[PDB]
Amino acid sequence: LEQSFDNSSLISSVKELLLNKDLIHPSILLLTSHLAHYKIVGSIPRCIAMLEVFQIVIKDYQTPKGTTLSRNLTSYLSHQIDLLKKARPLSVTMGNAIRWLKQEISLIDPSTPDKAAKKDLCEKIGQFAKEKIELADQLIIDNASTQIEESTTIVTYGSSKVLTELLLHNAISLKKNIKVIVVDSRPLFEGRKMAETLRNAGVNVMYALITSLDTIFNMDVDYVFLGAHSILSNGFLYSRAGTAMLAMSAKRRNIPVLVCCESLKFSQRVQLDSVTFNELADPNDLVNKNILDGWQELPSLNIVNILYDLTPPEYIKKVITEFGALPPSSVPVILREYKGSA
Amino acid sequence: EDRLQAVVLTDSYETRFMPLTAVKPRCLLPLANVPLIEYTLEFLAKAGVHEVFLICSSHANQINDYIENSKWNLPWSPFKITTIMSPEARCTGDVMRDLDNRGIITGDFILVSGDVLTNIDFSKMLEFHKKMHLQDKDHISTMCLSKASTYPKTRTIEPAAFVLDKSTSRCIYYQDLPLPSSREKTSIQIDPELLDNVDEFVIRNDLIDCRIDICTSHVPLIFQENFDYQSLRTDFVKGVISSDILGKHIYAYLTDEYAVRVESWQTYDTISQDFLGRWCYPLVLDSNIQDDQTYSYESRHIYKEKDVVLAQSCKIGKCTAIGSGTKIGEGTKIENSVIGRNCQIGENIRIKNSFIWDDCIIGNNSIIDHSLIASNATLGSNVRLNDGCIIGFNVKIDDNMDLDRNTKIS
Amino acid sequence: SDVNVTIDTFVAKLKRRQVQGSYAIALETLQLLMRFISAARWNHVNDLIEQIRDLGNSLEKAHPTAFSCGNVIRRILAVLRDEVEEDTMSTTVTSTSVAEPLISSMFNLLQKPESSMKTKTDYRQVAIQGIKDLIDEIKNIDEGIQQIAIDLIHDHEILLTPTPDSKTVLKFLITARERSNRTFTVLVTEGFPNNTKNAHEFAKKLAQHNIETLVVPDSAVFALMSRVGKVIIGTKAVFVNGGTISSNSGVSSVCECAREFRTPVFAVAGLYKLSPLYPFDVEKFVEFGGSQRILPRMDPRKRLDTVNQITDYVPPENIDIYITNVGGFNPSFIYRIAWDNYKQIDVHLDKNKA
Amino acid sequence: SIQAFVFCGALLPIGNRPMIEYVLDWCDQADGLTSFLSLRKQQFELIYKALSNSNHSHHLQDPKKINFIPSKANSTGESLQKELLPRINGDFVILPCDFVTDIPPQVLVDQFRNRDDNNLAMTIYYKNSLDSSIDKKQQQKQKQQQFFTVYSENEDSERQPILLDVYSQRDVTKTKYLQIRSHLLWNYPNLTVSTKLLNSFIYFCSFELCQLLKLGPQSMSRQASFKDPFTGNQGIFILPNETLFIRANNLNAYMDANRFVLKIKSQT
């Protein structure tokens, strides 16, 4: 009660809707079903999957009689976003795409016979993720590869989002020697997906848990690379929980730390505290007859499960985007030069 | 309850290890710088036993002198130790009936066939067996086995398929699964007349065989007059359940963690690395019990004793184990392999996935891959190897000898 | 003899973890030690320390990383190593008693020239009470803990421990709520995946005594570290640097993350949890665990590698105080308590005095 | 999207509502349970439909196409293949002739939701319920079913359990005495089978009308023999699914429906 972070109302556990005024897309319920019951995403996997259902749901237009297609879809698509907000609040990978999409709703005129409404939207929103994601990730590949020598180590955290493809390129598409250290944490064992993949790729993978983190650093170790969820306007890395403890330690143990990221994952907002702006996710998950049951109904017990947390930018040495590399204090200068400009 | 008898039998897999085994039994062979007699013996020292009964159908003279040099002939061991000599080719079960004709064994007792290695407790196995006593008087035994979950078809020699009960876990029938690389003999058969009082029953494959069964003394007397059974599970667990004897209930048991038994070198390939890793928790290598070793643990699974001369610029990779009396040289590479005690390593040799035993001298520029070397077998210069070289004991190798796959030379 | 087999089954008791924890092994190594005391015929007082120094080398070489057994044998030697010099100068006439406990230890090796009259049997019975007074100290170490820590801690601050497997603070925070009626909370993380057995057991019994408690995951402990300004760590053993041998898992990096926020870091330790040895290698005392409960799939064909760890070590710069039965102490003062309990000979506890 | 379809093949309905009608508004009870349309044969519909189209203020949008030939005049496996090319809209749900239940299909279409395992058909079933006693009928006509009973305790793999083959009494147990190909055993080799498993005929379905066109599944009568061949290599082809539950529902198969409505299904 003294910190009262349990009464930080960033999320509730509300469910069970029945309303049928909107024609709810059945497949967008599947997307929310695939998130909230068991999380299967990073952030750019959402930015793919949020786009996967959007190409389908615009194809079923269902434009009514006395309404322009500019007038209904700004309500029709945005009503379906609140289904996701019941499941999981948005990211900036969510956020920067959808406001760009709401521009495209507004910049059309009453001239389209709804047959032309596909290809002016379809390839355009396809060339979004073709440019802003795919070949944006291509420029990640050449930039990080020249900053990695052979016969070294990489320490990652959680499931990566883009540097999985980077580790595939340096182990197979360039065949230089490399050892991989993947560490994830209870409850979301998403780093095991990388641990399956890179040894299916056939490379030296050492799996790890965050409680045993010191003895990884007591060996020959360097080049700590990180996934990301958003970068603050200061330089704080808003990312998956438990990122900063290796980010403080490897910076304390004088070997450099980088964050693989992109310009789409920037943001205008700013903060400097970990427990201010976050999300909780269903406190039943940290249980597994069990050992304990009854965080409810029992006096003086609670289960927290932090999803996102900030890292100080002094821990990060170099921030790499698709345009290049940059020091972490110099993050917000792209916000005036490329994001909404490029 | 009390008086935990047992019976230990080696000497059934002399067919399996024929390039070796001419001078010493399979059970005498070193897994990780130390043999696998005492892996079982310390495991039934965990059982809290009072006596054992060895079977040595071959190489009988070089068994007890090793026990004379063990701690087990010295009076603080959990059991007194007894041996039984025998002539050759005395198969399983016929070792029992002649012992049953002797008839020392009273009550409950421990079958360990093959050579096993595990981490399972003795406790939860046994009241489960006593739960069978409290549920049945026509009971037979409880066969504890593990669950090779992510890997079917890599239990190398024989694939074993089991059908058992949901509730009581009574093993319904056994039929040996064929070779999985052989896509031809695609049929199993289970006669449903004996499927009366189960009606919800589990048919599995991944129960990896370890032959660790405990049973009462009545069922060898049942096994006595049925003298036409020659194996443990290939014939007898079928015929005791295929309606010939009426109302006899054998159970199995499944555990969620490690228990295994050596079948071939491919089993010797896998579980050596599993024991060298932390997959054998808690029975770990730095315990140093048997020849009261001096192994100190380091990260990435390094098992170094003392008196280890590590040269400059020789990288030691993951999953290695080094005894005393050893000297590596400059420019060599040590990775994912055990190293015998008291040996010599030359210059620029890449040992990789190969189990070199004691007293071995390797000539320079002679890399070794998937090729274990037995005792006293030195090498020469430019001796290149490949998969399956199971070269044997005291084998002099001259220079420049490259070999082919499955070189079972001696 | 009959005592020579009870040590062998005690040697067997220390191989395959037949006892765990820093508490119960010290009581059971000492009750078993009295059997060796009652059946010994030393015939000379320097033979009796030879009777026990090989026994420790039959024990410490048998299992190194247990220390609650390992520090008793030196301390119970030290109460007799004291009394060799007691009967030495009292036998003489000129300088029978000076009785100042400290001579300058630098100069003592650097000056070398070359009623109870004897009562040779008393070294037995003074060790028989030496059996008894050690255990009776261990039974109530918590009163010297609780005398100074409620002095040290205050009322309205949120807290955190990374060691739920500490029966000290399990017992201490009962009476830290009960007698002193201070209200607060404790954050509690898990020793994943090992003390999470007891971590769920820890806050539940504290939920019975309802100290506003809540369980945090191991990854979240940085994100709430800005709120909390005090951490306590229930350690397992402690060496001469003030670097302590802690409990199972997860506690070292969060002790590092606490130190980075300029947060005071507390520890509790009994006087018998002291150890006169030095941490030469950190990795010769950091014991690991198993690949079983850190991933259960056991792939033989993909077959990656993974690391467990069931011992964490911290430097003394990351620690601040030692709440003990005899007071709170500096991380660097630890020698003076230890060398008031141990001697320079049996710290190299080995028959080869090379 | 979801589409309904009802099969058909004393006849007097006992429980104060017609036998044929018991799947009509029951599969569309609330919002959620709405399929696209349902289909049915004639079955002298005038007694059935005139009471079924009573009490109307509820937007009872009921189209129903009628055939006569897949109505015990032909095997409903092969005859249905031509009866789907105008009938296809999206996902499929079939219905048996006279199905009854207690727990509504709102939670059963929830089982159809989270099916990202690229499935083609999941089959929600149940075993026999608590029967009366050792009955005063004939012997236990047990449909020995060849499948995987309990949930998979392995991640990512058969996360709903699998029906593998399908047989019964009198076909294998009286000719070849429960023989199984060990080849089809090799995929998920830790199986469990039962005897009282009542084939509930519910059979959630999908877009395999786009993908039944290869030869080998086209000769299927009885609408279950598609994983009865392993359909692989001598890799594996597409996958079925199966689901069941614990308690508190109903069905009917035999002539015991005269006594199912007597003491089990009382309504107050």
Side-chain angles (χ1 to χ4, degrees), chain B residues 162-173 195 198 200-204 207 251-254, chain D residues 191-192:
Chain B
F162 290 98
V163 52
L164 75 160
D165 194 4
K166 178 64 71 182
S167 66
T168 64
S169 69
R170 194 271 306 271
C171 184
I172 302 299
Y173 184 76
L195 272 300
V198 279
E200 290 87 3
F201 58 94
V202 183
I203 174 166
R204 294 178 68 88
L207 276 75
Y251 289 182
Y253 180 73
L254 58 91
Chain D
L191 286 81
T192 304

PDB file of all heavy atoms in Angstrom, chain B residues 162-173 195 198 200-204 207 251-254, chain D residues 191-192:
ATOM      1  N   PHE B 162       5.058 -50.085 -25.607  1.00  0.00           N
ATOM      2  CA  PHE B 162       4.340 -50.605 -24.453  1.00  0.00           C
ATOM      3  C   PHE B 162       2.906 -50.110 -24.452  1.00  0.00           C
ATOM      4  O   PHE B 162       2.640 -48.949 -24.778  1.00  0.00           O
ATOM      5  CB  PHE B 162       5.022 -50.189 -23.151  1.00  0.00           C
ATOM      6  CG  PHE B 162       6.335 -50.853 -22.923  1.00  0.00           C
ATOM      7  CD1 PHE B 162       7.516 -50.207 -23.246  1.00  0.00           C
ATOM      8  CD2 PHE B 162       6.392 -52.130 -22.390  1.00  0.00           C
ATOM      9  CE1 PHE B 162       8.732 -50.819 -23.036  1.00  0.00           C
ATOM     10  CE2 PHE B 162       7.605 -52.748 -22.173  1.00  0.00           C
ATOM     11  CZ  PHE B 162       8.776 -52.091 -22.502  1.00  0.00           C
ATOM     12  N   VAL B 163       1.987 -50.988 -24.070  1.00  0.00           N
ATOM     13  CA  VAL B 163       0.598 -50.628 -23.831  1.00  0.00           C
ATOM     14  C   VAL B 163       0.273 -50.937 -22.373  1.00  0.00           C
ATOM     15  O   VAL B 163       0.618 -52.012 -21.863  1.00  0.00           O
ATOM     16  CB  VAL B 163      -0.347 -51.326 -24.831  1.00  0.00           C
ATOM     17  CG1 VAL B 163      -0.128 -52.823 -24.880  1.00  0.00           C
ATOM     18  CG2 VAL B 163      -1.791 -51.028 -24.505  1.00  0.00           C
ATOM     19  N   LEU B 164      -0.323 -49.967 -21.683  1.00  0.00           N
ATOM     20  CA  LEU B 164      -0.564 -50.086 -20.254  1.00  0.00           C
ATOM     21  C   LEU B 164      -1.867 -49.390 -19.884  1.00  0.00           C
ATOM     22  O   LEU B 164      -2.512 -48.742 -20.709  1.00  0.00           O
ATOM     23  CB  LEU B 164       0.602 -49.525 -19.422  1.00  0.00           C
ATOM     24  CG  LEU B 164       0.826 -48.018 -19.274  1.00  0.00           C
ATOM     25  CD1 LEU B 164       1.683 -47.761 -18.051  1.00  0.00           C
ATOM     26  CD2 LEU B 164       1.496 -47.416 -20.497  1.00  0.00           C
ATOM     27  N   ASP B 165      -2.254 -49.543 -18.622  1.00  0.00           N
ATOM     28  CA  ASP B 165      -3.525 -49.024 -18.139  1.00  0.00           C
ATOM     29  C   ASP B 165      -3.428 -47.529 -17.857  1.00  0.00           C
ATOM     30  O   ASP B 165      -2.354 -46.995 -17.565  1.00  0.00           O
ATOM     31  CB  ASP B 165      -3.949 -49.765 -16.868  1.00  0.00           C
ATOM     32  CG  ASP B 165      -5.406 -49.525 -16.490  1.00  0.00           C
ATOM     33  OD1 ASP B 165      -6.131 -48.836 -17.241  1.00  0.00           O
ATOM     34  OD2 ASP B 165      -5.820 -50.016 -15.419  1.00  0.00           O
ATOM     35  N   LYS B 166      -4.572 -46.851 -17.966  1.00  0.00           N
ATOM     36  CA  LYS B 166      -4.677 -45.475 -17.498  1.00  0.00           C
ATOM     37  C   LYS B 166      -4.523 -45.400 -15.985  1.00  0.00           C
ATOM     38  O   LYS B 166      -3.605 -44.753 -15.469  1.00  0.00           O
ATOM     39  CB  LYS B 166      -6.017 -44.875 -17.925  1.00  0.00           C
ATOM     40  CG  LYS B 166      -6.233 -43.447 -17.449  1.00  0.00           C
ATOM     41  CD  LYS B 166      -5.226 -42.509 -18.079  1.00  0.00           C
ATOM     42  CE  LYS B 166      -5.522 -42.321 -19.554  1.00  0.00           C
ATOM     43  NZ  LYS B 166      -4.518 -41.445 -20.212  1.00  0.00           N
ATOM     44  N   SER B 167      -5.419 -46.065 -15.258  1.00  0.00           N
ATOM     45  CA  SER B 167      -5.464 -45.915 -13.809  1.00  0.00           C
ATOM     46  C   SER B 167      -4.389 -46.747 -13.119  1.00  0.00           C
ATOM     47  O   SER B 167      -3.495 -46.204 -12.461  1.00  0.00           O
ATOM     48  CB  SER B 167      -6.851 -46.301 -13.292  1.00  0.00           C
ATOM     49  OG  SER B 167      -7.102 -47.679 -13.506  1.00  0.00           O
ATOM     50  N   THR B 168      -4.454 -48.068 -13.266  1.00  0.00           N
ATOM     51  CA  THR B 168      -3.563 -48.951 -12.526  1.00  0.00           C
ATOM     52  C   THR B 168      -2.170 -49.038 -13.127  1.00  0.00           C
ATOM     53  O   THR B 168      -1.265 -49.545 -12.454  1.00  0.00           O
ATOM     54  CB  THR B 168      -4.157 -50.357 -12.443  1.00  0.00           C
ATOM     55  OG1 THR B 168      -4.255 -50.913 -13.760  1.00  0.00           O
ATOM     56  CG2 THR B 168      -5.542 -50.308 -11.821  1.00  0.00           C
ATOM     57  N   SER B 169      -1.994 -48.560 -14.366  1.00  0.00           N
ATOM     58  CA  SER B 169      -0.751 -48.668 -15.147  1.00  0.00           C
ATOM     59  C   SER B 169      -0.281 -50.118 -15.284  1.00  0.00           C
ATOM     60  O   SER B 169       0.920 -50.393 -15.325  1.00  0.00           O
ATOM     61  CB  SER B 169       0.364 -47.783 -14.575  1.00  0.00           C
ATOM     62  OG  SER B 169       0.821 -48.257 -13.319  1.00  0.00           O
ATOM     63  N   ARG B 170      -1.226 -51.055 -15.352  1.00  0.00           N
ATOM     64  CA  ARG B 170      -0.895 -52.447 -15.622  1.00  0.00           C
ATOM     65  C   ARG B 170      -0.499 -52.572 -17.083  1.00  0.00           C
ATOM     66  O   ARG B 170      -1.299 -52.254 -17.967  1.00  0.00           O
ATOM     67  CB  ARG B 170      -2.089 -53.350 -15.302  1.00  0.00           C
ATOM     68  CG  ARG B 170      -1.803 -54.867 -15.214  1.00  0.00           C
ATOM     69  CD  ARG B 170      -1.942 -55.601 -16.553  1.00  0.00           C
ATOM     70  NE  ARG B 170      -3.233 -55.362 -17.187  1.00  0.00           N
ATOM     71  CZ  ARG B 170      -4.316 -56.102 -16.983  1.00  0.00           C
ATOM     72  NH1 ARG B 170      -4.258 -57.152 -16.183  1.00  0.00           N
ATOM     73  NH2 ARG B 170      -5.451 -55.806 -17.600  1.00  0.00           N
ATOM     74  N   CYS B 171       0.717 -53.059 -17.331  1.00  0.00           N
ATOM     75  CA  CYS B 171       1.209 -53.220 -18.693  1.00  0.00           C
ATOM     76  C   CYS B 171       0.405 -54.298 -19.407  1.00  0.00           C
ATOM     77  O   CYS B 171       0.387 -55.459 -18.983  1.00  0.00           O
ATOM     78  CB  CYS B 171       2.694 -53.571 -18.687  1.00  0.00           C
ATOM     79  SG  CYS B 171       3.424 -53.693 -20.336  1.00  0.00           S
ATOM     80  N   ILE B 172      -0.266 -53.903 -20.486  1.00  0.00           N
ATOM     81  CA  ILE B 172      -1.236 -54.775 -21.133  1.00  0.00           C
ATOM     82  C   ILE B 172      -0.541 -55.839 -21.969  1.00  0.00           C
ATOM     83  O   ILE B 172      -0.914 -57.017 -21.926  1.00  0.00           O
ATOM     84  CB  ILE B 172      -2.200 -53.928 -21.981  1.00  0.00           C
ATOM     85  CG1 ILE B 172      -2.898 -52.883 -21.111  1.00  0.00           C
ATOM     86  CG2 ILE B 172      -3.211 -54.804 -22.687  1.00  0.00           C
ATOM     87  CD1 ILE B 172      -3.733 -53.472 -20.006  1.00  0.00           C
ATOM     88  N   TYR B 173       0.487 -55.448 -22.715  1.00  0.00           N
ATOM     89  CA  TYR B 173       1.120 -56.307 -23.704  1.00  0.00           C
ATOM     90  C   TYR B 173       2.427 -55.655 -24.118  1.00  0.00           C
ATOM     91  O   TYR B 173       2.590 -54.439 -23.988  1.00  0.00           O
ATOM     92  CB  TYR B 173       0.200 -56.505 -24.918  1.00  0.00           C
ATOM     93  CG  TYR B 173       0.694 -57.452 -25.979  1.00  0.00           C
ATOM     94  CD1 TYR B 173       0.638 -58.827 -25.790  1.00  0.00           C
ATOM     95  CD2 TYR B 173       1.193 -56.970 -27.181  1.00  0.00           C
ATOM     96  CE1 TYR B 173       1.081 -59.699 -26.769  1.00  0.00           C
ATOM     97  CE2 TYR B 173       1.634 -57.831 -28.166  1.00  0.00           C
ATOM     98  CZ  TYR B 173       1.574 -59.191 -27.954  1.00  0.00           C
ATOM     99  OH  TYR B 173       2.018 -60.049 -28.937  1.00  0.00           O
ATOM    100  N   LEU B 195      -8.399 -57.663 -22.883  1.00  0.00           N
ATOM    101  CA  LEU B 195      -8.666 -56.248 -22.660  1.00  0.00           C
ATOM    102  C   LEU B 195      -9.985 -56.015 -21.937  1.00  0.00           C
ATOM    103  O   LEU B 195     -10.668 -55.016 -22.205  1.00  0.00           O
ATOM    104  CB  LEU B 195      -8.647 -55.488 -23.990  1.00  0.00           C
ATOM    105  CG  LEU B 195      -7.319 -54.933 -24.528  1.00  0.00           C
ATOM    106  CD1 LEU B 195      -6.736 -53.957 -23.533  1.00  0.00           C
ATOM    107  CD2 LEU B 195      -6.295 -56.000 -24.875  1.00  0.00           C
ATOM    108  N   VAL B 198     -10.177 -53.109 -18.356  1.00  0.00           N
ATOM    109  CA  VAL B 198      -9.408 -51.869 -18.411  1.00  0.00           C
ATOM    110  C   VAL B 198     -10.183 -50.750 -19.115  1.00  0.00           C
ATOM    111  O   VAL B 198     -10.457 -49.709 -18.515  1.00  0.00           O
ATOM    112  CB  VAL B 198      -8.017 -52.102 -19.048  1.00  0.00           C
ATOM    113  CG1 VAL B 198      -7.074 -52.673 -18.015  1.00  0.00           C
ATOM    114  CG2 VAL B 198      -8.090 -53.120 -20.181  1.00  0.00           C
ATOM    115  N   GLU B 200      -9.933 -48.214 -20.781  1.00  0.00           N
ATOM    116  CA  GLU B 200      -9.261 -46.941 -21.031  1.00  0.00           C
ATOM    117  C   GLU B 200      -7.794 -47.214 -20.748  1.00  0.00           C
ATOM    118  O   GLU B 200      -7.408 -47.357 -19.584  1.00  0.00           O
ATOM    119  CB  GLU B 200      -9.774 -45.810 -20.136  1.00  0.00           C
ATOM    120  CG  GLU B 200     -11.175 -45.301 -20.416  1.00  0.00           C
ATOM    121  CD  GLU B 200     -12.239 -46.094 -19.690  1.00  0.00           C
ATOM    122  OE1 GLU B 200     -11.883 -47.006 -18.912  1.00  0.00           O
ATOM    123  OE2 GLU B 200     -13.433 -45.802 -19.892  1.00  0.00           O
ATOM    124  N   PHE B 201      -6.981 -47.303 -21.792  1.00  0.00           N
ATOM    125  CA  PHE B 201      -5.634 -47.809 -21.597  1.00  0.00           C
ATOM    126  C   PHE B 201      -4.681 -47.136 -22.568  1.00  0.00           C
ATOM    127  O   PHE B 201      -5.051 -46.782 -23.691  1.00  0.00           O
ATOM    128  CB  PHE B 201      -5.592 -49.341 -21.721  1.00  0.00           C
ATOM    129  CG  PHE B 201      -6.093 -49.876 -23.038  1.00  0.00           C
ATOM    130  CD1 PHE B 201      -5.215 -50.142 -24.073  1.00  0.00           C
ATOM    131  CD2 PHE B 201      -7.439 -50.160 -23.218  1.00  0.00           C
ATOM    132  CE1 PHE B 201      -5.667 -50.651 -25.274  1.00  0.00           C
ATOM    133  CE2 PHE B 201      -7.902 -50.661 -24.417  1.00  0.00           C
ATOM    134  CZ  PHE B 201      -7.013 -50.916 -25.445  1.00  0.00           C
ATOM    135  N   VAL B 202      -3.441 -46.980 -22.116  1.00  0.00           N
ATOM    136  CA  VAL B 202      -2.462 -46.100 -22.738  1.00  0.00           C
ATOM    137  C   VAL B 202      -1.434 -46.956 -23.461  1.00  0.00           C
ATOM    138  O   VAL B 202      -0.833 -47.849 -22.856  1.00  0.00           O
ATOM    139  CB  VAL B 202      -1.783 -45.215 -21.680  1.00  0.00           C
ATOM    140  CG1 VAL B 202      -0.825 -44.250 -22.322  1.00  0.00           C
ATOM    141  CG2 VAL B 202      -2.815 -44.495 -20.839  1.00  0.00           C
ATOM    142  N   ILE B 203      -1.217 -46.676 -24.743  1.00  0.00           N
ATOM    143  CA  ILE B 203      -0.237 -47.392 -25.551  1.00  0.00           C
ATOM    144  C   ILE B 203       0.857 -46.419 -25.979  1.00  0.00           C
ATOM    145  O   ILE B 203       0.601 -45.440 -26.690  1.00  0.00           O
ATOM    146  CB  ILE B 203      -0.894 -48.104 -26.747  1.00  0.00           C
ATOM    147  CG1 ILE B 203       0.169 -48.719 -27.663  1.00  0.00           C
ATOM    148  CG2 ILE B 203      -1.940 -47.232 -27.458  1.00  0.00           C
ATOM    149  CD1 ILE B 203      -0.392 -49.710 -28.650  1.00  0.00           C
ATOM    150  N   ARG B 204       2.082 -46.683 -25.532  1.00  0.00           N
ATOM    151  CA  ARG B 204       3.176 -45.736 -25.679  1.00  0.00           C
ATOM    152  C   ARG B 204       4.371 -46.394 -26.350  1.00  0.00           C
ATOM    153  O   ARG B 204       4.397 -47.601 -26.605  1.00  0.00           O
ATOM    154  CB  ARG B 204       3.601 -45.158 -24.325  1.00  0.00           C
ATOM    155  CG  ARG B 204       2.546 -44.299 -23.682  1.00  0.00           C
ATOM    156  CD  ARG B 204       2.979 -43.795 -22.324  1.00  0.00           C
ATOM    157  NE  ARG B 204       4.072 -42.839 -22.435  1.00  0.00           N
ATOM    158  CZ  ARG B 204       3.893 -41.533 -22.594  1.00  0.00           C
ATOM    159  NH1 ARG B 204       2.665 -41.036 -22.654  1.00  0.00           N
ATOM    160  NH2 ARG B 204       4.937 -40.725 -22.692  1.00  0.00           N
ATOM    161  N   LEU B 207       8.902 -45.034 -23.486  1.00  0.00           N
ATOM    162  CA  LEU B 207       9.453 -45.576 -22.249  1.00  0.00           C
ATOM    163  C   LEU B 207      10.780 -46.241 -22.579  1.00  0.00           C
ATOM    164  O   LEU B 207      10.822 -47.366 -23.080  1.00  0.00           O
ATOM    165  CB  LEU B 207       8.485 -46.554 -21.592  1.00  0.00           C
ATOM    166  CG  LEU B 207       7.382 -45.979 -20.695  1.00  0.00           C
ATOM    167  CD1 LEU B 207       6.250 -45.332 -21.486  1.00  0.00           C
ATOM    168  CD2 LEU B 207       6.842 -47.049 -19.753  1.00  0.00           C
ATOM    169  N   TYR B 251       2.991 -54.655 -13.250  1.00  0.00           N
ATOM    170  CA  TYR B 251       2.892 -53.227 -13.491  1.00  0.00           C
ATOM    171  C   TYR B 251       4.207 -52.708 -14.050  1.00  0.00           C
ATOM    172  O   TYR B 251       5.255 -53.350 -13.949  1.00  0.00           O
ATOM    173  CB  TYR B 251       2.543 -52.436 -12.222  1.00  0.00           C
ATOM    174  CG  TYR B 251       1.131 -52.598 -11.693  1.00  0.00           C
ATOM    175  CD1 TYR B 251       0.715 -51.894 -10.567  1.00  0.00           C
ATOM    176  CD2 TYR B 251       0.195 -53.386 -12.352  1.00  0.00           C
ATOM    177  CE1 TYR B 251      -0.577 -52.014 -10.084  1.00  0.00           C
ATOM    178  CE2 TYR B 251      -1.093 -53.521 -11.875  1.00  0.00           C
ATOM    179  CZ  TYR B 251      -1.476 -52.828 -10.746  1.00  0.00           C
ATOM    180  OH  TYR B 251      -2.765 -52.957 -10.277  1.00  0.00           O
ATOM    181  N   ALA B 252       4.129 -51.533 -14.655  1.00  0.00           N
ATOM    182  CA  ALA B 252       5.296 -50.744 -14.995  1.00  0.00           C
ATOM    183  C   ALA B 252       5.306 -49.499 -14.122  1.00  0.00           C
ATOM    184  O   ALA B 252       4.464 -49.326 -13.237  1.00  0.00           O
ATOM    185  CB  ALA B 252       5.306 -50.368 -16.481  1.00  0.00           C
ATOM    186  N   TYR B 253       6.273 -48.627 -14.374  1.00  0.00           N
ATOM    187  CA  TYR B 253       6.324 -47.330 -13.720  1.00  0.00           C
ATOM    188  C   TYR B 253       7.036 -46.336 -14.619  1.00  0.00           C
ATOM    189  O   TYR B 253       8.067 -46.651 -15.220  1.00  0.00           O
ATOM    190  CB  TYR B 253       7.025 -47.399 -12.363  1.00  0.00           C
ATOM    191  CG  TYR B 253       7.089 -46.063 -11.666  1.00  0.00           C
ATOM    192  CD1 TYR B 253       5.950 -45.499 -11.109  1.00  0.00           C
ATOM    193  CD2 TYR B 253       8.287 -45.363 -11.568  1.00  0.00           C
ATOM    194  CE1 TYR B 253       5.997 -44.278 -10.471  1.00  0.00           C
ATOM    195  CE2 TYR B 253       8.345 -44.137 -10.932  1.00  0.00           C
ATOM    196  CZ  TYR B 253       7.197 -43.601 -10.384  1.00  0.00           C
ATOM    197  OH  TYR B 253       7.241 -42.383  -9.748  1.00  0.00           O
ATOM    198  N   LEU B 254       6.480 -45.136 -14.704  1.00  0.00           N
ATOM    199  CA  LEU B 254       7.065 -44.061 -15.485  1.00  0.00           C
ATOM    200  C   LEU B 254       7.550 -42.967 -14.547  1.00  0.00           C
ATOM    201  O   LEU B 254       6.882 -42.634 -13.563  1.00  0.00           O
ATOM    202  CB  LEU B 254       6.057 -43.514 -16.514  1.00  0.00           C
ATOM    203  CG  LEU B 254       4.695 -42.943 -16.094  1.00  0.00           C
ATOM    204  CD1 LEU B 254       4.724 -41.433 -15.844  1.00  0.00           C
ATOM    205  CD2 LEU B 254       3.632 -43.296 -17.126  1.00  0.00           C
TER     206      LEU B 254
ATOM    207  N   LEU D 191      -0.070 -43.199 -27.292  1.00  0.00           N
ATOM    208  CA  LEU D 191      -1.499 -43.074 -27.526  1.00  0.00           C
ATOM    209  C   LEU D 191      -2.289 -43.646 -26.360  1.00  0.00           C
ATOM    210  O   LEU D 191      -1.764 -44.364 -25.506  1.00  0.00           O
ATOM    211  CB  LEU D 191      -1.923 -43.800 -28.809  1.00  0.00           C
ATOM    212  CG  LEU D 191      -1.622 -43.272 -30.212  1.00  0.00           C
ATOM    213  CD1 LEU D 191      -0.196 -43.622 -30.631  1.00  0.00           C
ATOM    214  CD2 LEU D 191      -2.644 -43.805 -31.215  1.00  0.00           C
ATOM    215  N   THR D 192      -3.577 -43.317 -26.348  1.00  0.00           N
ATOM    216  CA  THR D 192      -4.522 -43.857 -25.381  1.00  0.00           C
ATOM    217  C   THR D 192      -5.860 -44.030 -26.080  1.00  0.00           C
ATOM    218  O   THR D 192      -6.346 -43.098 -26.728  1.00  0.00           O
ATOM    219  CB  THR D 192      -4.675 -42.932 -24.168  1.00  0.00           C
ATOM    220  OG1 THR D 192      -3.393 -42.693 -23.581  1.00  0.00           O
ATOM    221  CG2 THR D 192      -5.585 -43.563 -23.127  1.00  0.00           C
TER     222      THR D 192
END
